[PDB]
Design a protein around this ligand. Structure first.
Ligand SMILES: *CCCCC*
Length: 14
C-alpha cells in the first residue's frame, strides 16, 4: 500500500 489513504477514501464512500 504505497499510499494508505485511497482505501480509506473508498471505505468512507461506502
Ligand atoms: C479514492 C477513491 C475516491 C472515490 C470517491
Amino acid at each position: 500500500r504505497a499510499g494508505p489513504l485511497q482505501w480509506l477514501a473508498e471505505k468512507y464512500q461506502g
